[PDB]
Paper text:
Four crystal structures of BoPDA bound to divalent cations were solved: to Co2+, Ni2+, Zn2+, and Cu2+ at 1.42 Å, 1.48 Å, 1.36 Å and 1.56 Å respectively. Co2+, Ni2+ and Zn2+ are the most common cations used by CE4 enzymes for catalysis. Our four metal-bound BoPDA crystal structures allowed us to investigate the metal-binding strategy of BoPDA given it lacks the canonical His-His-Asp triad. In the Co2+ bound BoPDA structure the divalent cation is coordinated with a His213-Asp102 dyad and four water molecules. The Co2+ ion is coordinated through typical octahedral geometry when validated using the CheckMyMetal (CMM) server, with acceptable values for all the CMM parameters. A composite omit map was generated for the BoPDA-Co2+ structure and it shows clear, defined density for the Co2+ cation and each water molecule modeled. Additionally, instead of four water molecules completing the metal binding site as in the BoPDA-Co2+ structure, there is a glycerol molecule (green, sticks) and 1 to 2 waters interacting with the Ni2+, Zn2+ or Cu2+ ion. Taken together, this suggests that the preferred metal for BoPDA is likely Co2+, and it may have reduced or no activity with Ni2+, Zn2+, or Cu2+. Through analysis of our structures, we hypothesize that Co2+ might be the catalytically relevant divalent ion for BoPDA enzymatic activity.
Residue numbers in the entry: 40 to 499
The structure:
């Protein structure tokens, strides 16, 4: 019965198998050249920012907020939006939508520099040791007597966060669920693995490796530095301001500076107003001198939706495409690869070159964003007869950039199976335009293969 009230635990039908992700990748890409395009010398580098972007935007949304799903994630991913209400996953799955719902008509994204969409990425904190994540959702198609089922919840329900994981959204610790008087360094340290166990239980064995400091409470940083699963941290003070083109050291266990850009009291300005102003000032400097725009957010709203669209229209896919909009975990992993991986290219014969690179994350858990960009100097797309890759490469796109050649290499072990899960979702909901768009987006991440061809045929 469509009109009957149901109170359900939000659930998604698949989650990327984070626990199974391989920690070590061995990339081997073979480049075969056209006969009259024999080149004499090639050399390679991993660029400062993925996709050869010019500058970095980092976003972490605190307090495990309902709006991280209903506003932030929904706006990025082309989902139904509301001006005053807060959808849960089960509302979207059932088509039980609030009375003011609308859509932007597009996703919010950059390109990867080689012709594919890269949707904006961000992280949310998680209140994994808080039973309020187990709250149910009221679903009732066609019910208009009230809209209480769409009111803001105190925090995300697990199903919302589980679905966000399928789109690369990151996670971070924040407050832990202890009495205020028990928030000592030692007691917080003991509670981190308790929260971690729930994260792994619910997020298909993903391990959280980030702390967003709560409310200037340094006991959280001191405790987190003794819990070796946490590799990256952020705070407003007692941190390091990130300059992506200048930073030279290890950032293992480093507190990266992140600002909320609160507006002056009574000024009528919003946080997005303040961030926009900071971005404009920063872009006046040469890219090598720019700090990262590293931001925190609390509740997101219509103004934040419009700000995300402004970023898309100005520095993303519909603007100058200069920005890398990501979460701190993906950036941390990329910086680690740039520091420790050493791409090499060797001539195999007169017309064949072999590019090799190892991606090895830290010993605590598999890195979850095992993708890099490699530039080849001395080569152009027009020289190339064919490109082949080994099994560890699951996504591969490439093309000219400025006067050189770039490859975007994705090594997520279960990427093809993940794309097929989105295809199956579309096949089960073939009238859902957003489901078909998601299927095309994920299938387009895959390297050329029989499986990619199969999946493309299923979503024509
Ligand atoms: Co907070």
């Amino acid at each position: 019965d469509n009109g009957k009230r149901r109170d359900v635990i939000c659930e998604t039908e698949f989650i990327y198998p984070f626990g199974n992700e391989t920690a070590d990748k061995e990339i081997e890409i073979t480049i075969h050249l056209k006969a009259d395009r024999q080149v004499g010398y090639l050399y390679t580098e991993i660029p400062t920012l993925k996709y050869n972007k010019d500058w970095l935007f980092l976003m972490t949304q605190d307090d495990c907020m309902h709006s991280a799903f209903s506003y932030t994630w929904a706006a990025i991913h082309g989902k139904p939006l509301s001006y005053i209400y807060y959808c849960d996953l089960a509302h979207l799955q059932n088509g039980d939508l609030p009375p003011d719902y609308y859509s932007l008509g597009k996703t919010l994204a950059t390109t990867n520099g080689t012709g594919q969409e890269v949707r904006f990425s961000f992280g949310t904190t998680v209140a994994a040791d808080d039973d309020l994540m187990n709250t149910q959702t009221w679903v009732q198609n066609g019910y208009t007597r009230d809209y209480f089922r769409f009111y803001k919840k105190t925090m995300l329900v697990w199903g919302n966060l589980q679905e966000m994981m399928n789109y690369g959204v990151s996670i971070a610790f924040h407050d832990l669920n202890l009495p205020d008087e028990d928030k000592t360094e030692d007691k917080l340290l003991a509670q981190f693995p308790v929260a971690q166990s729930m994260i792994r239980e619910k997020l298909n064995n993903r391990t959280c490796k980030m702390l967003a400091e709560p409310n200037g409470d340094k006991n959280y940083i001191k405790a987190a530095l003794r819990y070796d699963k946490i590799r990256t941290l952020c705070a407003q003070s007692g941190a390091t301001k990130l300059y992506p083109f200048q930073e030279n050291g290890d950032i293992e266990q480093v507190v990266i500076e992140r600002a909320f850009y609160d507006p002056p009291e009574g000024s009528g300005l919003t946080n997005p107003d303040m961030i926009k102003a900071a971005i404009l000032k920063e872009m006046e400097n040469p890219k090598e001198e720019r700090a990262a725009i590293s931001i925190g957010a609390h509740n997101t709203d219509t103004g934040w939706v419009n700000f995300l669209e402004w970023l898309n229209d100005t520095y993303g896919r519909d603007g100058d495409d200069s920005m890398w909009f990501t979460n701190q975990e993906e950036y941390y992993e990329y910086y680690y690869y740039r520091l420790h991986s050493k791409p090499e290219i060797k001539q195999v014969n007169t017309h064949t070159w072999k590019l090799t690179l190892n991606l090895n994350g830290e010993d605590s858990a598999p890195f979850y964003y095992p993708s890099v960009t490699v530039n080849i100097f001395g080569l152009k797309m027009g020289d190339i007869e064919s490109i082949k890759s080994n099994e560890d490469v699951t996504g591969l796109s490439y093309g000219d950039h400025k006067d050189f050649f770039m490859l975007n290499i994705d090594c997520r072990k279960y990427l093809a199976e993940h794309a097929e899960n989105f295809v199956k979702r579309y096949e089960a909901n073939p009238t859902d335009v957003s489901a078909k768009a998601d299927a095309n987006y994920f299938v387009n991440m895959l390297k050329d293969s029989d499986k990619k061809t199969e999946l493309k045929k299923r979503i024509e």
